[PDB]
């Protein structure tokens, strides 16, 4: 029983930075956080800040 070579060349690395898009562009007042709709930026205290609610069944503040 002979040893097999341990010690190889390393796991892909982050060679890409292409970044994903907003869940909206849509900026609307802090009291329509979600409304029907479920994914919009949130214009609050002289900021904006996407809530989206993921399919999964999760909210995302996102700045």
């Known amino acids: 029983m002979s040893r097999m070579d341990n010690t190889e060349l390393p796991h892909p690395k982050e060679i890409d930075n292409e970044t994903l898009l907003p869940a909206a562009e849509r900026r609307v007042n802090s ?33």
Do not use: F, S, W
């Not at 009291?31 to 069944?57: F, M, S, W």
């Open 31 to 63: 009291q329509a956080l979600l409304g029907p709709d479920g994914k919009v930026i949130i214009d609050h205290n002289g900021q904006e800040y996407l809530l989206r609610k993921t399919q999964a069944g999760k909210l995302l503040l996102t700045k």
